[PDB]
Amino acid sequence: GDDRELAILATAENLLEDRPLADISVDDLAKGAGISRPTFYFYFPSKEAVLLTLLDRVVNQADMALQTLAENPADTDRENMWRTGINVFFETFGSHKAVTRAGQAARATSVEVAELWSTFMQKWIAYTAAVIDAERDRGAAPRTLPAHELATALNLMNERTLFASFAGEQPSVPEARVLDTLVHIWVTSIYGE
Amino acid sequence: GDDRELAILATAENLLEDRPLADISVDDLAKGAGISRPTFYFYFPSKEAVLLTLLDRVVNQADMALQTLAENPADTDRENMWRTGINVFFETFGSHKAVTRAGQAARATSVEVAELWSTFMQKWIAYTAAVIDAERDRGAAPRTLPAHELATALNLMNERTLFASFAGEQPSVPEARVLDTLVHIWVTSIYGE
Numbered sequence A, B: 001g002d003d004r005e006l007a008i009l010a011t012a013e014n015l016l017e018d019r020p021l022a023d024i025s026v027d028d029l030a031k032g033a034g035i036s037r038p039t040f041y042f043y044f045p046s047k048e049a050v051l052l053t054l055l056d057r058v059v060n061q062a063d064m065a066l067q068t069l070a071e072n073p074a075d076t077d078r079e080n081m082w083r084t085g086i087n088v089f090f091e092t093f094g095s096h097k098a099v100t101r102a103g104q105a106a107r108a109t110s111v112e113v114a115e116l117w118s119t120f121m122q123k124w125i126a127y128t129a130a131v132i133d134a135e136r137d138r139g140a141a142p143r144t145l146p147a148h149e150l151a152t153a154l155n156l157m158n159e160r161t162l163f164a165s166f167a168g169e170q171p172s173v174p175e176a177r178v179l180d181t182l183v184h185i186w187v188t189s190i191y192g193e
């Protein structure tokens, strides 16, 4: 019923590991899901609408996990608090590299993708800034930069840096080193005078 | 003679302020340069080869300026040393926003662009790492992260962050705040324990 939808989504994610969206046809999506081309079009208006949904589930999965984290503070030092948080994005997006990769290229092309990306980045930065302000109220962090400006730049560091390594871009931090690399820069910029 | 070449380049840069490369024709480039379509094709094989050259001159201008900077150390504190360096990329790319913007989208499309980007990023990161290692040998910076890993992440922060503000992306640091924002994170991650 809507299992067909889930089949189209899985087919697309599987196919995107091996070629870009450009070299995948609706034909290829329908085939994989075991439906006709016109039945495909019942569920989605384009291959692009399939990417968008994929990215939507990845982004919301990241977001929900961060909500679960924020509701249950891990009992640990500040370094470990930040690491646990950044890890939500490392694991989540790192488990969906094809979708991550395709979503990011699609930003230049698709206004819906760009907006979806935009909404969640705003949210996570807002959250980052809230935690930093809390850390300054507490007395644990110095009032250096505007919290929102710092949060913005740290989050953009994480987008670029997580995605370069996920794609094996030259240059990039190796994936097995990227978590530590980011946490250092976060902790040191948030706590440093 | 090759003034026609310079005319094509200026026409393209002027046109790119107002629409993407997709909505600019070879016709539009030839017109602006005051040549025929076939004479255009004498000088460049595509609109894309025109972008590539544009980006090449922007990137080399950035690079040469950093070479001039490295050869003549500005006599100042460490914060100001880094700021002066990051400023080379702020000013250079910030004076060529249309080209910057178009080059970055073209990375997903054009393998020549991606490689050109790749080469210079490797160079600037290598330079960043060399300066940090020097700062650790001097005794001025602690041996925290692997210098090259740190350099990689800081440079990727700068790419993403400079270009988001240049494009007025939501979200982004405002352009009049981005220099200070970056220098803070650099100095604090390089000098911090």
Ligand SMILES: CCCCCNC(=O)N1CCC(C)CC1
Binding pocket: A082, A085, A086, A087, A089, A093, A121, A124, A125, A127, A128, A131, A155, A156, A158, A159, A162
């Ligand atoms: C895919 C990267 C998108 C943004 C990455 N943001 C990020 O790392 N955060 C968000 C704030 C949390 C407290 C943990 C750190």
Ligand SMILES: CCCCCNC(=O)N1CCC(C)CC1
Binding pocket: B082, B085, B086, B087, B089, B093, B121, B124, B125, B127, B128, B131, B155, B156, B158, B159, B162
């Ligand atoms: C367009 C951004 C590309 C990379 C930006 N790199 C950057 O800011 N650097 C390079 C190292 C210098 C010592 C100054 C700081």
